[PDB]
Amino acid sequence: YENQKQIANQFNKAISQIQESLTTTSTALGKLQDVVNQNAQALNTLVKQ
Amino acid sequence: IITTDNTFVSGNCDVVIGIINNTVYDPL
Amino acid sequence: SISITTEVMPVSMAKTSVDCNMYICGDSTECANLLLQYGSFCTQLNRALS
Ligand SMILES: *[C@@H]1O[C@H](CO)[C@@H](O)[C@H](O)[C@H]1NC(C)=O
Ligand SMILES: *[C@@H]1O[C@H](CO)[C@@H](O)[C@H](O)[C@H]1NC(C)=O
Could you tell me which residues belong to the region Heptad repeat 1 (chain A)? Predict the structure, then answer.
Protein backbone atom coordinates (compact mmCIF):
# COMPACT_ATOMS: atom_id res chain seq x y z
CA TYR A 1 0.00 0.00 0.00
CA GLU A 2 2.81 2.44 0.80
CA ASN A 3 4.49 1.58 -2.53
CA GLN A 4 1.43 1.11 -4.77
CA LYS A 5 2.38 3.62 -7.47
CA GLN A 6 5.88 2.18 -7.98
CA ILE A 7 4.43 -1.32 -8.41
CA ALA A 8 1.81 -0.04 -10.85
CA ASN A 9 4.46 1.70 -12.97
CA GLN A 10 6.74 -1.36 -12.97
CA PHE A 11 3.81 -3.56 -14.05
CA ASN A 12 2.95 -1.20 -16.92
CA LYS A 13 6.57 -0.99 -18.08
CA ALA A 14 6.97 -4.78 -18.00
CA ILE A 15 3.82 -5.21 -20.11
CA SER A 16 5.15 -2.64 -22.59
CA GLN A 17 8.52 -4.41 -22.82
CA ILE A 18 6.75 -7.72 -23.54
CA GLN A 19 4.76 -5.92 -26.25
CA GLU A 20 7.88 -4.59 -27.99
CA SER A 21 9.82 -7.84 -27.57
CA LEU A 22 7.08 -9.73 -29.40
CA THR A 23 7.14 -7.04 -32.10
CA THR A 24 10.86 -6.84 -32.91
CA THR A 25 11.26 -10.12 -34.83
CA SER A 26 11.38 -12.77 -32.11
CA THR A 27 12.14 -16.47 -32.35
CA ALA A 28 10.61 -17.05 -28.91
CA LEU A 29 7.62 -18.65 -30.65
CA GLY A 30 9.90 -21.18 -32.34
CA LYS A 31 8.49 -24.02 -30.24
CA LEU A 32 5.14 -23.56 -31.97
CA GLN A 33 6.85 -23.37 -35.36
CA ASP A 34 8.41 -26.84 -35.13
CA VAL A 35 5.00 -28.50 -34.68
CA VAL A 36 4.15 -26.99 -38.07
CA ASN A 37 7.56 -27.77 -39.61
CA GLN A 38 7.84 -31.39 -38.45
CA ASN A 39 4.46 -32.31 -39.92
CA ALA A 40 4.96 -30.72 -43.35
CA GLN A 41 8.23 -32.62 -43.82
CA ALA A 42 6.35 -35.77 -42.80
CA LEU A 43 3.77 -35.29 -45.56
CA ASN A 44 6.30 -34.25 -48.22
CA THR A 45 8.07 -37.57 -47.68
CA LEU A 46 4.84 -39.53 -48.13
CA VAL A 47 4.14 -37.88 -51.49
CA LYS A 48 7.71 -38.42 -52.69
CA GLN A 49 7.46 -42.20 -52.17
CA ILE B 1 -14.12 -6.58 17.43
CA ILE B 2 -11.11 -4.64 16.14
CA THR B 3 -8.50 -4.93 18.88
CA THR B 4 -4.74 -4.39 19.20
CA ASP B 5 -4.36 -8.20 19.33
CA ASN B 6 -5.43 -8.84 15.72
CA THR B 7 -4.09 -5.62 14.13
CA PHE B 8 -0.53 -4.38 13.62
CA VAL B 9 0.80 -0.83 13.36
CA SER B 10 2.94 0.62 10.57
CA GLY B 11 3.51 4.15 9.32
CA ASN B 12 1.17 7.12 9.21
CA CYS B 13 -2.33 7.39 7.75
CA ASP B 14 -1.31 9.49 4.75
CA VAL B 15 0.28 7.19 2.17
CA VAL B 16 -2.48 4.57 2.22
CA ILE B 17 -5.23 5.23 -0.33
CA GLY B 18 -8.72 4.46 0.94
CA ILE B 19 -7.98 4.72 4.64
CA ILE B 20 -10.79 5.59 7.07
CA ASN B 21 -11.33 6.77 10.65
CA ASN B 22 -12.52 4.28 13.26
CA THR B 23 -11.98 3.51 16.93
CA VAL B 24 -9.67 0.70 18.07
CA TYR B 25 -10.40 -1.02 21.36
CA ASP B 26 -7.47 -1.53 23.71
CA PRO B 27 -7.65 -4.71 25.83
CA LEU B 28 -5.57 -3.02 28.59
CA SER C 1 16.30 -38.66 13.80
CA ILE C 2 17.96 -37.30 10.66
CA SER C 3 17.80 -39.70 7.72
CA ILE C 4 19.71 -39.33 4.44
CA THR C 5 18.36 -41.38 1.53
CA THR C 6 19.23 -41.87 -2.13
CA GLU C 7 17.27 -41.47 -5.36
CA VAL C 8 18.82 -42.64 -8.65
CA MET C 9 17.49 -41.26 -11.92
CA PRO C 10 18.43 -41.66 -15.60
CA VAL C 11 18.87 -38.47 -17.64
CA SER C 12 20.39 -39.38 -21.02
CA MET C 13 21.46 -42.38 -23.08
CA ALA C 14 24.12 -43.18 -25.63
CA LYS C 15 24.07 -41.40 -28.97
CA THR C 16 24.58 -43.48 -32.10
CA SER C 17 24.78 -43.14 -35.86
CA VAL C 18 24.36 -45.60 -38.71
CA ASP C 19 25.71 -45.39 -42.25
CA CYS C 20 22.81 -46.74 -44.31
CA ASN C 21 24.76 -47.54 -47.49
CA MET C 22 27.68 -49.05 -45.59
CA TYR C 23 25.45 -51.29 -43.46
CA ILE C 24 23.28 -52.49 -46.35
CA CYS C 25 25.69 -52.52 -49.29
CA GLY C 26 29.26 -51.77 -48.21
CA ASP C 27 31.63 -50.89 -51.04
CA SER C 28 29.60 -52.35 -53.91
CA THR C 29 28.49 -50.16 -56.80
CA GLU C 30 26.03 -52.77 -58.07
CA CYS C 31 24.30 -52.84 -54.68
CA ALA C 32 24.28 -49.03 -54.57
CA ASN C 33 22.43 -48.95 -57.89
CA LEU C 34 19.65 -51.24 -56.64
CA LEU C 35 19.31 -49.35 -53.36
CA LEU C 36 18.20 -46.26 -55.30
CA GLN C 37 14.98 -47.98 -56.38
CA TYR C 38 13.68 -48.17 -52.82
CA GLY C 39 13.56 -44.41 -52.51
CA SER C 40 14.75 -42.04 -49.82
CA PHE C 41 15.01 -44.49 -46.93
CA CYS C 42 18.52 -43.63 -45.75
CA THR C 43 17.86 -39.90 -45.36
CA GLN C 44 14.88 -40.58 -43.07
CA LEU C 45 16.81 -43.01 -40.86
CA ASN C 46 19.78 -40.65 -40.59
CA ARG C 47 17.42 -37.76 -39.79
CA ALA C 48 15.66 -39.75 -37.05
CA LEU C 49 18.88 -40.92 -35.38
CA SER C 50 20.22 -37.36 -35.61
C1 LIG D 1 -13.63 4.03 -5.71
O2 LIG D 1 -13.95 4.41 -7.06
C3 LIG D 1 -14.85 5.53 -7.13
C4 LIG D 1 -15.18 5.72 -8.59
O5 LIG D 1 -14.02 5.59 -9.41
C6 LIG D 1 -14.19 6.75 -6.50
O7 LIG D 1 -15.12 7.83 -6.51
C8 LIG D 1 -13.77 6.45 -5.07
O9 LIG D 1 -13.03 7.54 -4.54
C10 LIG D 1 -12.92 5.18 -5.01
N11 LIG D 1 -12.61 4.84 -3.63
C12 LIG D 1 -11.39 4.49 -3.21
C13 LIG D 1 -11.26 4.16 -1.76
O14 LIG D 1 -10.44 4.44 -3.98
C1 LIG E 1 -10.18 11.55 10.06
O2 LIG E 1 -9.88 12.51 11.08
C3 LIG E 1 -9.05 13.60 10.65
C4 LIG E 1 -8.78 14.45 11.87
O5 LIG E 1 -8.86 15.83 11.56
C6 LIG E 1 -9.75 14.36 9.53
O7 LIG E 1 -8.89 15.39 9.05
C8 LIG E 1 -10.11 13.41 8.39
O9 LIG E 1 -10.86 14.10 7.40
C10 LIG E 1 -10.92 12.23 8.91
N11 LIG E 1 -11.20 11.29 7.84
C12 LIG E 1 -12.42 11.12 7.32
C13 LIG E 1 -12.53 10.11 6.22
O14 LIG E 1 -13.39 11.76 7.72
Answer: 4-49
